[PDB]
Amino acid sequence: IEEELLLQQIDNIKAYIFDAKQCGRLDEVEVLTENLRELKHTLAKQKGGTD
Amino acid sequence: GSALRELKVCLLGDTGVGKSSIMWRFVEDSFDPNINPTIGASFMTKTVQYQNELHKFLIWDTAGLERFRALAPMYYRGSAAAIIVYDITKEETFSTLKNWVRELRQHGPPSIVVAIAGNKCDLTDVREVMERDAKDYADSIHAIFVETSAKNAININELFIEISRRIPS
Ligand SMILES: Nc1nc2c(ncn2[C@@H]2O[C@H](COP(=O)(O)OP(=O)(O)OP(=O)(O)O)[C@@H](O)[C@H]2O)c(=O)[nH]1
Numbered sequence: 343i344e345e346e347l348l349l350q351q352i353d354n355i356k357a358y359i360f361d362a363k364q365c366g367r368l369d370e371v372e373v374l375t376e377n378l379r380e381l382k383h384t385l386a387k388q389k390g391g392t393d
Numbered sequence: 394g395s396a397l398r399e400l401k402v403c404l405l406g407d408t409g410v411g412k413s414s415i416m417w418r419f420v421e422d423s424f425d426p427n428i429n430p431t432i433g434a435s436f437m438t439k440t441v442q443y444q445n446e447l448h449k450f451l452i453w454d455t456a457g458l459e460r461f462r463a464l465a466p467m468y469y470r471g472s473a474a475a476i477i478v479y480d481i482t483k484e485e486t487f488s489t490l491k492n493w494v495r496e497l498r499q500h501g502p503p504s505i506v507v508a509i510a511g512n513k514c515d516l517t518d519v520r521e522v523m524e525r526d527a528k529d530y531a532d533s534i535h536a537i538f539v540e541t542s543a544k545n546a547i548n549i550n551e552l553f554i555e556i557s558r559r560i561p562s
């Protein structure tokens with residue numbers, strides 16, 4: 343993934359998280375947080391920190 | 394938790410076919426002729442009662458624009474179902490759909506529920522993909538098949554009801 347596009351989607355999911363936290367949907371905060379974790383793992387992989 | 398079944402579903406397909414419009418029709422019961430191309434991937438949910446059980450659809454709406462193709466695995470991986478959308482008026486989008494099937498088959502279990510949505514079915518006078526042929530292809534890959542219209546609210550509910558029926562979780 344083009345690195346800047348990956349960083350932008352991380353920011354997008356963070357925006358979904360900010361909104362799901364401001365509301366009451368706890369189960370969706372977790373779903374979105376899991377996706378955030380996965381995007382961050384992919385970013386760390388693209389930087390060579392893990393395989 | 395015990396009563397509510399979470400269902401992760403991912404929308405895939407070429408830019409312009411109507412993935413986001415399908416999602417907005419299902420979730421918000423609306424249509425926008427001027428909806429913009431998706432950036433990255435979007436997310437919506439809907440809680441329903443189908444087959445006398447409660448389900449929450451967790452819907453990931455991927456960007457079909459070319460630069461985002463490499464982002465899609467972040468959304469289709471771990472999905473219970475993939476909805477691959479084409480435009481019945483553009484045969485090239487059905488060829489693209491077959492590429493998406495290959496991508497899924499390379500990276501996901503053969504058991505994943507696949508649904509094929511031939512969207513923009515309201516545009517009957519300019520059809521390029523024959524329904525008979527699309528249905529036959531869907532059968533050949535054991536996929537759900539519907540022709541849909543997000544604009545005219547045709548077969549959108551049917552699509553999700555059948556996905557729910559097929560997911561064995
Ligand atoms: N006539 C008709 N137009 C539709 C239908 N569904 C979507 N459109 C229109 O087709 C265009 C593209 O729809 P989108 O929902 O943005 O398509 P998409 O697949 O999400 O595209 P990307 O986000 O770029 O991948 C928009 O102008 C919609 O208004 C439909 O069922 N019938």
Ligand SMILES: [Mg+2]
Nearest residue numbers: 412413430431
């Ligand atoms: Mg879209």
